[PDB]
């Protein structure tokens with residue numbers, strides 16, 4: 065084994081390695097080994113797209129297929145070890161550190177895309193639709209939206225609609241009954257980590273945020289068929305996003321008010337992208353909770369009846385966040401392995 | 415390939431080789447300028463030179479004198495070529511990221527090290543005790559730090575800094591000894607006062623009881639031999655000087671004692687890791703070398719913490735060099751050889767790689 069192969073094999077020995085961890089590590093190794101191939105960039109793009117959509121089974125299958133196709137350059141023993149490790153990884157909703165890091169970075173990238181060529185007309189019209197949706201007891205001081213800050217403020221102020229206007233959508237929903245969030249009020253905890261990254265998780269020195277209090281949310285383990293239990297690849301920051309039903313109501317008013325808009329689908333996708341970026345970056349929800357609200361059968365029917373094709377904020381250029389998450393994965397795995405070795409060394413020393 | 419471990423403190427730079435159990439070169443972190451002199455040479459020529467401290471409160475503020483300190487460490491103290499040794503450096507908790515970037519840039523472009531790593535001093539102190547989770551009180555010479563560490567990561571949201579360390583205790587001891595009629599106003603007098611602080615001062619379990627005993631009896635009075643043949647007696651100052659750690663108001667500081675800052679750090683952490691922090695309280699630094707400081711910390715934290723909580727204070731005898739000991743343990747590990755930021759990685763990524771590799 066060379067130095068790179070030995071480093072990869074040691075990182076794969078990380079006891080808390082999950083499917084995202086494995087995908088990132090093996091993609092980094094395959095880029096460093098077979099990256100010179102002409103067809104590799106297509107494979108890397110497909111793997112990154114699978115990872116963004118949390119299609120971890122498909123990503124792992126594609127990675128294993130590539131490894132078997134290059135079993136001579138890599139090594140039969142190494143490929144066999146990778147195959148064995150592929151079936152040994154799982155996902156913990158409470159502990160997906162690489163996924164939380166990647167989702168924070170991808171929310172930041174979504175925000176960067178949003179700020180470039182920002183169209184304020186879309187969110188002015190969304191504010192108008194919000195004014196014709198919200199009840200009389202909810203105030204709205206956003207008379208006009210001219211900047212990305214005001215649009216994000218309106219997105220975040222959509223939370224005053226909860227339990228009033230989206231109740232019908234939640235009742236019609238078949239997956240919201242599987243939402244598993246503890247009713248217990250655990251208070252707030254301090255953090256220096258951005259977005260949905262856990263407070264105690266390691267972070268890059270340039271990635272920390274000013275210390276702030278965030279709500280402590282637990283999983284309802286007593287729930288039967290809970291969303292977190294059913295979908296463990298999704299990092300549990302909260303349960304299914306109920307405020308996104310309020311967003312869907314506001315978007316219904318938006319679409320019925322702009323049925324003749326030629327770029328209606330693009331505007332709705334822009335709004336959904338801003339919603340996802342704001343909710344991941346503020347630590348309210350992970351990507352798949354919001355997106356699975358958008359993927360509900362009756363919500364999908366609502367969006368299909370308006371001739372709207374949602375892209376679910378999926379972008380085709382996630383190379384930077386993917387590689388940074390790979391570096392974060394390598395750091396965490398190597399640090400844990402070294403911690404094992406250091407604990408053993410000091411224990412044997414004394 | 416021998417790794418250099420260099421712990422740069424505010425008052426003492428401790429440098430040596432990985433695998434050794436003691437810093438081969440412990441010298442004052444001072445730079446004398448009239449060409450410059452670094453370390454014991456600048457201290458000896460105190461009158462002729464102007465002394466400057468490149469590190470204050472554990473943070474490097476003057477990078478030129480820091481470069482001089484590192485050059486003296488590599489060539490004039492360790493007598494090794496920096497280009498053939500991976501140099502593991504140490505940094506203060508909550509160190510600015512620009513400082514880490516400048517550190518790696520100076521290591522790679524000025525000294526041409528083949529590899530380097532930067533680690534938090536408190537994390538290395540915890541490593542020296544064989545722990546990855548626990549709260550470390552690292553009181554050196556310029557600053558005191560309460561650093562809770564979870565699985566090798568120092569939690570930025572719960573670390574606190576108390577501007578109270580050995581320098582303040584030495585100044586307070588000078589003030590009290592002046593209150594007794596002993597004139598200590600010069601730099602040599604400062605050094606001999608620091609010697610008395612190291613040799614005689616201790617932490618009292620009960621400060622009021624110790625003060626009452628000193629007022630009543632004379633059992634706590636100890637004799638010390640001054641450099642100029644004089645013999646001076648020190649009484650209640652043996653525990654009054656270190657008590658400023660637990661009662662900063664002795665020097666007019668509005669902050670809280672080290673026990674209270676420790677409790678505040680533990681409270682700033684999640685309730686699920688508070689038990690681990692309470693059970694792993696690691697003392698580190700020269701200012702933690704006072705006799706009885708561990709017992710006093712245990713008593714005060716037991717008073718502050720919930721009654722059912724288990725509190726263990728870890729104060730190894732070598733806790734003065736625990737940062738360097740942990741660094742030497744780290745840099746001599748087989749799994750650590752891949753964490754070295756190599757010259758190729760620095761060239762392809764720039765200094766910012768320190769945030770991605772040293773975290």
Ligand SMILES: Nc1ncnc2c1ncn2[C@@H]1O[C@H](COP(=O)(O)OP(=O)(O)OP(=O)(O)O)[C@@H](O)[C@H]1O
Pocket residue numbers: 422423424425426427470471472473535552553554555556557558579580581608611612613698699700701702703704734
């Ligand atoms: N046995 C001792 N008893 C009391 N104080 C001591 C003892 N030994 C050293 N000190 C004091 O501890 C300080 C040195 O501690 P240390 O070397 O850990 O600090 P440093 O690394 O220079 O500082 P920093 O806090 O910035 O990391 C000096 O002020 C010294 O006088």
Ligand SMILES: Nc1ncnc2c1ncn2[C@@H]1O[C@H](COP(=O)(O)O)[C@@H](O)[C@H]1O
Pocket residue numbers: 219220221222223226279302303304305306307308348349
């Ligand atoms: N716009 C917002 N402002 C403040 N908190 C929010 C917002 N949206 C969601 N949250 C919080 O996110 C968590 C999940 O809410 P929901 O998305 O309605 O399931 C709850 O703790 C909410 O209070």
Ligand SMILES: [Ca+2]
Pocket residue numbers: 422423424535554699737
């Ligand atoms: Ca120190």
